[PDB]
Symmetry: C4
Subunit: 274 residues, 4 copies
């Protein structure tokens, strides 16, 4: 075809990672981004693939993802660098017929260790597929600065934290009416945190990791980035308000109820009851 | 002609939306921008228009806008993306001979729903035309971060809020001597908030929506952006000052009076009396 | 020659104004920048000049500036736009043989009112020429955000304010050992504020206008920008420290004395005595 | 060859300095960056070198660096300008056979004074070579804003300061398990501060200079920048948290212990014991 680096999905991965870098959310190798593709996306470019795509087994088979391709940021790669060398910093993988492993079709020098966070991402993709009847395609982790700061000062409780974010920008209830699930602090990279995050993804499109960052899902790169950006903007507003001594006034429960009815969403009951 | 994407007004819309994106004012699809044009602006490009421009009725006819073209950001579009694909994210519309509806001449894939916020914008354009004897041409809504934060901590009163913004940068009284009208919180997208905003636009070039954002008017894209940027800069200064424990000294009433006389403006009486 | 827009000084004016825009210091038409040139800079380009350069008298003759060319930002122009259209937003002027007026050689559509702030700038250039035996060539005014915020919370006194800025970054005493002169608030654009600023320029390379901004001088665009940037960086640090409850420790008088001796500067006595 | 300005190491120096400029860490001539090269890096370009490379003696011979080339930012140069004119703002130097001096092979107009900070950098390179069995190649000094602010409000003690940075982003213990060494304030540019910094570099990859900035080491430009960026991001989070009234909850000692075991690092004992 044209080269795969000019494909919609490589260009989209470059845009999202670069935008997140520019926001200050992705120091060093902090953050990861995975996008579920279709065969029709990657098929024109198959002669650009690795001659012998490396195979990586999954310890935990995921048959819901059989035969499914993804484009991913590599483990240890810097979001800042994706724009400079997408083939070095991104990979295209395809899960096998059994969901027992994946082949690295393109990128990452055909190496296994830059795909280390994929089994955790894959667990969350699976729960988002089920929760959204296949609409969601993206899992994005970043170190969203104000959301992180808030985890040191707000109660790390889904209802309470959700409610404050809803109050901090009018749009938030409409963008994430299901709220933001808040886990306990957990050691990153473990089976435990991957399972716990996927469990929260059953009920929320946003999950926070206290003293660490955020994990979001959505149907497209832009919608997923925009979801995170909306929560982080509210957080930014809140950090300013709290630094000024706290809220003198805010959006009321009654107003939040009226907002949800107008926009035809069901706000998370526990956060709305506060 | 040359292509319409290189026209002064498409390029100007790209600049304004991109600049607002870069300021952090327009997460996701937050914000909207409409610019009133003349027939002479768009006429050279008419063979670039949609073959059969889609017609959208206005529930509320606006004869003051008969035969008037505009360029607009689409409903649901991201300011960040305007620079990447102006034809997808912007539309050119023209109100009909009766003010009873508009045709989508260009952009937006000739679709109706990305023009959903136009009847509210149009109500404010009408009041600004009358208030400025036709000089004002732009309505801009964005989520200006520090202005939003201030609505949680200052009294949401036109006089009081105006006065603080005037104190937070010397230029402000000269740039917006008529002040900043502050509405109650209202559900967005409703006839109620569109009418209420237009009512405030009779008396002010800036209107704030508590816990949401700002709505500004002016004669050009740059002047309208600059108006908002001036208020938001003052707000940024104020958030820092309030975070440091508040004002030790400030611009006095007497100084604000002297400033207005030198620059030949009439400052809003209620804000000046404080 | 090559076109004058590619000249070192037009390119330098673009860089400085653009960098200041990007810092957030120059909303709207806030700020102004003037650079003293030599005839040898502009001579190659004389056939690019206005056919009949417009003449503007100076109410206050300045014979020290006889025959001297400058490149300037226009009155009412936006720093953001200089990069897009330097000829519209910048002018080259040359003071006449008597210092009684200046000709607009290039730019600004050969119009007088975008040169309105020049008589004030010229007064400060004159005092900086005398104070530096002709080394200083630049006067820069901008709305440096943290410096502005500090004028609401620190005593607006040269010694006190200088001392805090020296404490807020180790470099500051070495970069501006003569300190920062602080005026009372004054109505901008007046003969009074222009004279008062020039009077302070006799003793300091930096002057602050409370609740407004900063005015700096130096030998080159980069050194002048860097001077302002150094003070503003210290201010940024200070705003954070004050927002966190104030200094637990700081640079001592004894340390500031040792710093000045090592770097061979004489720190402003009043600020050092505190 | 191709020109040396397109070499990996000139391009890398441009990227790192530009990125640091954009972060706000390197006002004026604040900051310095040195990268240890191999002969094979520079050899293709030798006919681009100065005809007669200037020789600069070292007062303190450093035989560990005999025959070793480096690329460096010049003394007095602005990080902002490196991208505009790398040959003016960068130099390539090579230490002689005895470690008694260095030749300026390229850049800096073959002048001595823009290499003034090299003997201090070289002392730290020597200790990092020994501490890392030759893996570390980069010394970077910058004025990282939030780290600087924190030195006015936290105890300037290695253990205490390290512990807070570890708490302010989960990654930090894994990225700098050896902690951040904190010196007393010292007059910059002196033999004393260069020796003291090198002494701290024996035990830490990061050193802070209170009321001034940070000094980091690592194997590549990206890893060194990323190290600093990680500490500075944590600092940014902390400044927000402290401005909001302090931590309500944080990462516990027990959690930090579990984190270090999972990632196979030995956290600095004193910081972990708190
Ligand atoms: Ca939950
Ligand atoms: Ca009003
Ligand atoms: Ca003085
Ligand atoms: Ca130590
Ligand atoms: Zn992470
Ligand atoms: Zn709960
Ligand atoms: Zn809005
Ligand atoms: Zn009122
Ligand atoms: Zn000004
Ligand atoms: Zn005094
Ligand atoms: Zn330094
Ligand atoms: Zn200790």
């Amino acid at each position: 075809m044209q080269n795969i680096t000019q494909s919609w999905f490589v260009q989209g991965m470059i845009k999202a990672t670069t935008d997140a870098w520019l926001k200050g959310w992705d120091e060093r190798n902090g953050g990861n981004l995975t996008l579920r593709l279709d065969d029709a996306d990657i098929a024109p470019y198959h002669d650009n693939f690795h001659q012998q795509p490396r195979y990586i087994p999954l310890s935990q088979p995921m048959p819901l993802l059989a035969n499914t391709p993804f484009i991913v940021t590599g483990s240890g790669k810097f979001f800042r660098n994706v724009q400079l060398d997408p083939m070095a910093n991104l990979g295209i993988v395809k899960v096998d017929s059994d969901g027992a492993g994946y082949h690295i079709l393109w990128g990452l020098f055909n190496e296994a260790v830059p795909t280390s966070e994929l089994p955790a991402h894959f667990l969350s993709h699976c729960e988002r597929i089920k929760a959204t009847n296949g609409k969601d395609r993206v899992i994005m982790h970043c170190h969203a600065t104000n959301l992180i700061a808030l985890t040191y000062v707000l109660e790390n409780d889904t209802a309470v934290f959700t409610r404050q974010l809803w109050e901090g920008s009018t749009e938030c209830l409409v963008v994430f009416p299901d709220g933001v699930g808040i886990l306990p602090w957990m050691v990153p990279g473990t089976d435990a945190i991957g399972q716990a995050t996927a469990q929260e993804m059953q009920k929320h499109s946003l999950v926070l990791w206290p003293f660490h960052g955020v994990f979001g899902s959505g149907p497209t790169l832009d919608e997923t980035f925009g979801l995170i950006d909306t929560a982080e903007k509210s957080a930014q507003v809140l950090v300013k308000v709290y630094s000024m001594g706290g809220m003198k006034q805010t959006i009321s429960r009654e107003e939040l109820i009226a907002l949800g009815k107008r926009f035809g969403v069901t706000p998370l009951a526990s956060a709305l009851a506060l």
